[PDB]
From a paper:
PoxtA and OptrA are ATP binding cassette (ABC) proteins of the F subtype (ABCF). They confer resistance to oxazolidinone and phenicol antibiotics, such as linezolid and chloramphenicol, which stall translating ribosomes when certain amino acids are present at a defined position in the nascent polypeptide chain. ARE–ABCFs are comprised of two ABC nucleotide-binding domains (NBD1 and NBD2) that are separated by a helical linker termed an ARD (antibiotic-resistance domain), and, depending on the species, ARE–ABCFs may also have an additional “Arm” subdomain inserted within NBD1 as well as a C-terminal extension (CTE). Cryo-EM structures of PoxtA on the ribosome reveal that it binds in the E-site and, despite the short ARD, still induces a distortion of the P-site tRNA, leading to retraction of its CCA-end from the PTC.
Therefore, we focused on the PotxA(EF9F6)-EQ2–70S sample and subjected it to structural analysis using single-particle cryo-EM. Using a Titan Krios transmission electron microscope with a K2 direct electron detector, we collected 3640 micrographs which, after 2D classification, yielded 140,310 ribosomal particles. In silico sorting revealed that 80% of these particles contained an additional density for PoxtA and/or tRNAs, which after 3D refinement resulted in a cryo-EM map of E. faecalis 70S ribosome with an average resolution of 2.4 Å. Subsequent multibody refinement yielded average resolutions of 2.2 Å and 2.5 Å for the LSU and SSU, respectively. The increase in resolution compared to the previous E. faecalis 70S ribosome models at 2.8–2.9 Å15,37 is evident from improved quality and features of the cryo-EM density, including visualisation of some rRNA modifications (e.g. N2-methylguanosine), water molecules and hydrated magnesium ions. The best-resolved region of PoxtA was the ARD, consisting of two α-helices (α1 and α2) and the ARD loop, where the majority of sidechains could be modelled unambiguously. In particular, two glutamine residues, Gln275 and Gln279, located at the distal end of the α-helix α1 of the ARD insert into the minor groove of the acceptor’s arm where hydrogen bond interactions can form with the C3-G70 basepair. Ser281 is within H-bonding distance to the phosphate-oxygen of A73, whereas the sidechain of Gln282 stacks upon the base of C74 and can interact with the ribose-hydroxyl of A72. The ARD is stabilised by multiple contacts between residues within α-helix α2 and rRNA nucleotides located in H74 and H93. For example, the sidechains of Arg294 and Arg297 contact nucleotides A2595–G2598 (E. coli numbering used throughout) located within the loop of H93 of the 23S rRNA, and Glu293 interacts with G2597 directly as well as G2598 via a putative water molecule.
Residue numbers in the entry:
A (entry chain W): 1 to 91
B (entry chain 6): 1 to 44
C (entry chain G): 2 to 275
Write the structure that this text describes.
RNA sequence: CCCAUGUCCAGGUUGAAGGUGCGGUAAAACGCACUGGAGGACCGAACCCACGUACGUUGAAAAGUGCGGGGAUGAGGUGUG
RNA sequence: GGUAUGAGUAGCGAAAGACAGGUGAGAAUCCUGUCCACCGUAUGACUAAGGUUUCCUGGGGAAGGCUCGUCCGCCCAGGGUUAGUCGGGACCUAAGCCGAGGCCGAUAGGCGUAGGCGAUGGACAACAGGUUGAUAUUCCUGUACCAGUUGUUUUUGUUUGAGCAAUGGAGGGACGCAGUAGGCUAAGGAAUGCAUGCGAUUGGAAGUGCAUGUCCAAGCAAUGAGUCUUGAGUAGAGUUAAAUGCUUUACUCUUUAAGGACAAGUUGUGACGGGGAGCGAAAUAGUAGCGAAGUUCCUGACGUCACACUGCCAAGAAAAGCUUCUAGUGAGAAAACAACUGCCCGUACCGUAAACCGACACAGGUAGUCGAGGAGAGUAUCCUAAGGUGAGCGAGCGAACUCUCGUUAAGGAACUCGGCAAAAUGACCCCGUAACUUCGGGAGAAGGGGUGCUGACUUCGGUCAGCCGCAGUGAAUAGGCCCAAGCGACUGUUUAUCAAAAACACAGGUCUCUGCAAAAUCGUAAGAUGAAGUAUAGGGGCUGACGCCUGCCCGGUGCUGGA
RNA sequence: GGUGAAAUUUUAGUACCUGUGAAGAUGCAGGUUACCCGCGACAGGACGGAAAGACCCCAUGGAGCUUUACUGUAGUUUGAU
């Protein structure tokens, strides 16, 4: 897959916003991307230097509307920690 | 009082899973029957 | 020797066991050990084919040199060892060239004896020779039925056989059962009788000990139901109530011979017994 | 029922064989102490079982609970595959 | 399918709550507080499975909740699971499974070799604290370790070649049960050891008073209770080819040692750090923040050294990792330091359960770990600690009857099919203990005595003396006994869910088959079990410990032999 | 006060005695007794509820079992080829 397709979007939440204060950035990533790919994708997309990437899988969540019930899509969340002496991401 | 169903993820797949069904000719007959009937879930 | 346990318990009452005096070590030769799983009488279909087998203690197989075809060098007896897989004891022998083997321990074998095999070996206990080289009247064991195949007959504790004569390419042998037959003269045998003669005198003593030795209980046919056994059914205790007692599969159990009536070996069996 | 591989059995009790010493003897058998720690051994929780009885009997439960009961290092219990 | 009747009846599922204040349209039922009560070898703390969002936060009160509801494991809306080191994969094999060719077979297929798959086992590198509403050995802080990469410096090797190194030779990994000694350390207890805070009105106490707390990794360095082990050399044979490795045969010397291999733990450093009784802020909580002491003595682990030792018979995985050896491969290697690289999956939450299996927020069932104190042998028992809980209908009344429980005059089995049920016995110490016996037993037979408190005195178990009560294992929890007969020797096993027995099994006995491609059994067969066993073995029938015994009949029927 | 089933049920304004009757009637006959509606209790009756009697017999029903029932047959064995 292309590097520009690995990173889907940022994650903006109370937890991710807090983590930005520590210079780590949460993204939704392609479910098939390993944390090394994410590191490479982040660096090429933002010119930053990445110190560490932590990565989790998010299970699909049960939801219902009216008479219909199903599941939200599975997601893959990558927390990218930038090095010191490095540019930050500005989303 | 121990009841008959003692759930076990692995044993469910090993006994009833898709690959167990596919590995025998009569297992494939089951999958053919489930598909013919139109079951949303053909294997366990 | 056989030691008799005092009746400290009803289970211990009347029980006896060997004192294992002849056993010189309990450290088996690692190189010669192989794994055996307990089949518990079940075959490759997973069915019980032989009843009353299963459970009991775990065992490691000791590879026994039944062929005794290493003739170049002599082997010095190092130990007499317990073997869970057979009624006889086994002897660890070191060949002068460093090859290690187990043999069945003959009666009178002693640590330090130097054993030889081959046509020119002396007629001494523990030596293995082709039957053609063994004088008539000699007590032998571990008789191979086919040249190079390895000893098959006369291997259990205390057993022995005797050379009776030579006719043609065959040696006349009296087996332990009393049968007299011809064995191909190129077949080898070991001189002596098998040791641990006292094995037969052991009073097992309690049901649990038989379970240790991998024997599951026998149920008599008479106390089964008719769909389980020809002896099953009837009200109260019953007699056999048939022409003759039979096995679970209807085969007569008293006196009926089961040897194939067209056996090839019949030509080689001179006088039967058992 | 079996196979492979794990695992569990609070705490007490009794004191088999063997060994040692001193007696005994030609040597012994053998006697007495001590030591030794055997057992489908003993008492008893967990654990397993299910003997009596009451109760329950549109139940708390499609077989249980209460009070007692048996086994509890074994032919033992039990997990995983 | 709808709706009646029974009925406004049965039931509302094993238990403690009370009141104040609050919230709100509304509260026995939600929140807060206080006291009270319940579990505590647990009703606590973990974790595997299983579940699969039930976790957190903010709202909600239709339905679900056996009542209620402002509340909820429910509904709505948002959010939450972070690892080179944990568990799994990129490592290993067991049972078993699959199975190239192959063997077998109306078809279908069955079996099976090489080769694999497959843990419940083997192997394998980090820890303590902090942090969030919800994750943390995963984030952060500190300090590590394992594999590898690039570069710098330092040494030494360039084919009389260091080094690397087999899929090959080896070694190793590597294993049972029981029994106690011993060492260490959790842990526990005590103290007029230390630290901090207090002097308490209900009569008394400023001291021998009260309450509380009383120490910390991995790594690294050094040591270490101890544990196991003889160590050489000469000459030979071997190790499909080689070897300096390894196996081994002889022979010399050694062996209370020697050398070697292991080792719980300890001390120091990690740590000027972190925790820590308690004190305790603002701009509105007990939260920032700050922060004392860390001693002695007693007990002391089947937790660990360690299956180390001893004994036993029933005799107790494999493979890889690993370590060696050459064969081969080699031009470069290694050390130090610096910088840097390290993937996938799981990681929320419940988990003796209202979130698992039981149709239920069901008195059942659910592997493993930790599981404190007093008295105690104890994880029993009673009450408690840390911690958790008051259990999803209530308020009255205090009838019959039913259930569960307590006490009963005199009698004491008269009850009844039957002492069913209940009562009584019950712990520890001491005295004592029959027939019979297979000499072990029977026995805890039986039958008796003692048990509290306070001084004196002790050979440390008592003794003497005194004292109080109806009663001293003052509560709780720990045999009723004896005589005799039948049956079964015994411990065991069985009709899950009306039978636990005299039934089955059993050790022992006997008969018989079976000479090994054994008999026997599964299978059309191949292929298996029997057995990697071999007549002291294996199959089958019957009997059923042990003791004494087991008589007569072979005409019949079977079997065996004859022919 | 709250919540709220069930088995059963042809419609029921559903007494007693003696009698009658498919021979044991709340319901028929004759006589006797009895104001209307409940509540707490007890079980004699409603041949009470539950289960299309299991005993018994029957059906040219079924199934399991036995054998010197009949007819076959796997297996075993003997001969020919
Ligand atoms: K479906
Ligand atoms: K016995
Ligand atoms: K043996
Ligand atoms: K039997
Ligand atoms: K019978
Ligand atoms: K009961
Ligand atoms: K109804
Ligand atoms: K009604
Ligand atoms: K709410
Ligand atoms: K991992
Ligand atoms: K494992
Ligand atoms: K090397
Ligand atoms: K470590
Ligand atoms: K340290
Ligand atoms: K987690
Ligand atoms: K104590
Ligand atoms: K306790
Ligand atoms: K409530
Ligand atoms: K009342
Ligand atoms: K009553
Ligand atoms: K009476
Ligand atoms: K007695
Ligand atoms: K007294
Ligand atoms: K007792
Ligand atoms: K019996
Ligand atoms: K018996
Ligand atoms: K008898
Ligand atoms: K019983
Ligand atoms: K039985
Ligand atoms: K007998
Ligand atoms: K027999
Ligand atoms: K018989
Ligand atoms: K027998
Ligand atoms: K006869
Ligand atoms: K006859
Ligand atoms: K009628
Ligand atoms: K009635
Ligand atoms: K039937
Ligand atoms: Mg992860
Ligand atoms: Mg048998
Ligand atoms: Mg029977
Ligand atoms: Mg039959
Ligand atoms: Mg019969
Ligand atoms: Mg009879
Ligand atoms: Mg016992
Ligand atoms: Mg007991
Ligand atoms: Mg259990
Ligand atoms: Mg049972
Ligand atoms: Mg008993
Ligand atoms: Mg009523
Ligand atoms: Mg309740
Ligand atoms: Mg309590
Ligand atoms: Mg308890
Ligand atoms: Mg919640
Ligand atoms: Mg909420
Ligand atoms: Mg409600
Ligand atoms: Mg692992
Ligand atoms: Mg196969
Ligand atoms: Mg093929
Ligand atoms: Mg293989
Ligand atoms: Mg590890
Ligand atoms: Mg949490
Ligand atoms: Mg005062
Ligand atoms: Mg060679
Ligand atoms: Mg210890
Ligand atoms: Mg968690
Ligand atoms: Mg429950
Ligand atoms: Mg009385
Ligand atoms: Mg009285
Ligand atoms: Mg009477
Ligand atoms: Mg009477
Ligand atoms: Mg009674
Ligand atoms: Mg008491
Ligand atoms: Mg019995
Ligand atoms: Mg019993
Ligand atoms: Mg039953
Ligand atoms: Mg019963
Ligand atoms: Mg019998
Ligand atoms: Mg009439
Ligand atoms: Mg009438
Ligand atoms: Mg009328
Ligand atoms: Mg009329
Ligand atoms: Mg009726
Ligand atoms: Mg009928």
């Amino acid at each position: 897959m292309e590097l520009l397709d690995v990173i889907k979007r940022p994650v903006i939440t109370e937890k991710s916003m807090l983590a930005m204060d520590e210079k780590k950035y949460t993204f939704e990533v392609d479910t098939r991307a390993n944390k090394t790919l994410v590191k490479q994708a982040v660096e090429s997309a933002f010119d930053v230097k990445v110190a560490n990437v932590n990565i989790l899988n998010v299970r699909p969540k049960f939801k219902r509307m009216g008479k219909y019930a199903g599941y939200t899509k599975k997601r893959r969340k990558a927390i990218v920690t930038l090095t010191e002496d490095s540019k930050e991401i500005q989303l | 009082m121990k009841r008959t169903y003692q759930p076990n993820k692995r044993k469910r797949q090993k006994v009833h899973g898709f690959r167990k069904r596919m590995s025998t000719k009569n297992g494939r007959r089951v999958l053919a029957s489930r598909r013919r009937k139109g079951r949303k879930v053909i294997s366990a | 020797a056989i030691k008799k346990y005092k009746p400290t318990t009803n289970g211990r009452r009347n029980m006896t066991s060997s004192d294992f005096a002849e056993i010189t070590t309990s450290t088996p030769e690692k190189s010669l050990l192989q794994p055996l799983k307990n089949n518990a009488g079940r075959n490759n279909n997973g069915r019980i084919t032989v009843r009353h087998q299963g459970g009991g203690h775990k065992r490691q197989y000791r590879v026994i040199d039944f062929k005794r075809n290493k003739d170049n060098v002599a082997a010095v007896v190092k130990t007499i060892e317990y073997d869970p897989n057979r009624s006889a004891n086994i002897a660890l022998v070191h060949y002068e060239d460093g090859v290690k083997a187990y043999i069945l321990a003959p009666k009178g074998l002693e640590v330090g004896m130097r054993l030889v095999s081959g046509p020119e070996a002396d007629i001494k206990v523990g030596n293995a020779l082709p039957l053609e080289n063994i004088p008539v009247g000699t007590v032998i064991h571990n008789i191979e039925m086919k040249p190079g195949k390895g000893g098959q007959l006369i291997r259990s504790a205390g057993t022995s056989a005797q050379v009776l004569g030579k006719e043609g390419k065959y040696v006349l042998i009296r087996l332990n059962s009393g049968e007299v037959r011809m064995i191909l003269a190129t077949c080898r045998a070991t001189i002596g009788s098998v040791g641990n003669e006292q094995h037969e005198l052991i009073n097992i003593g309690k049901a649990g000990r038989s379970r240790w030795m991998r024997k599951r209980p026998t149920v008599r046919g008479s106390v089964m139901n008719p769909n389980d056994h020809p002896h099953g059914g009837g009200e109260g205790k019953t007699p056999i109530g048939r022409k003759a007692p039979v096995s679970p599969w209807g085969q007569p159990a008293i006196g009926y011979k089961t040897r194939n009536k067209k056996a090839k070996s019949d030509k080689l069996i001179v006088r039967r017994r058992t």
